[PDB]
Design a binder for this molecule. Sequence first.
Ligand SMILES: COc1c(C)cnc(Cn2cc(C#CCC(C)(C)O)c3c(Cl)nc(N)nc32)c1C
Length: 210
Amino acid sequence: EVETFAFQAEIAQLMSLIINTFYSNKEIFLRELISNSSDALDKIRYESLTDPSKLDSGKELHINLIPNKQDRTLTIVDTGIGMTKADLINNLGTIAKSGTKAFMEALQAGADISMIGQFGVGFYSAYLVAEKVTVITKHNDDEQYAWESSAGGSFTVRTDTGEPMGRGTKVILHLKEDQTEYLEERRIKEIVKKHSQFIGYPITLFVEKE
Ligand SMILES: COc1c(C)cnc(Cn2cc(C#CCC(C)(C)O)c3c(Cl)nc(N)nc32)c1C
């Protein structure tokens, strides 16, 4: 079964701002998602120092970038710590409230959208380029879940029945029709080299069969 939830009011306002503001420097979404993956890998690495069994669900710590021109999706996969159901439904929205309000204040004061990551809400920059985001995630302590939202004020959570993941997070960006440049190899490489050169995990860009 699928459960449908309302976003916290401030996050709903932030998403509406990101979708309807004219902002041409959209490539920053990819930096923010890679940064999130790097942080998630740090966290499971740290936990495994005192309990190595935490890596039973997968010892490789990496980030994969998978463009798909046929479905018009860009998928960012990491083998980091992942998210529990309580993270997806309550915790991430609750902790984001303060930074969201701070970010919207700064924006009016003079900040621009590229500072979004400094307020801890970089994930939502995905909606600069995507009309829908699907997040598949598996934490050691919980089941595999699929989160989805097309904005519009709500999100869904279901237990995922697709292929098991072991551990980590898969962010699937369903790209807007006019944002297909982020499916091009040359463009993804340009962005990673510019914004992400000092990430401490291997980033593999998959090539498309064509
Ligand atoms: C469900 O969609 C999201 C929403 C609504 C908000 N933010 C994020 C960003 N985000 C957050 C991650 C986390 C966590 C909990 C801990 C304690 C690990 O920080 C987290 C984690 Cl663990 N991994 C990744 N790749 N992204 C994460 C996402 C993916």
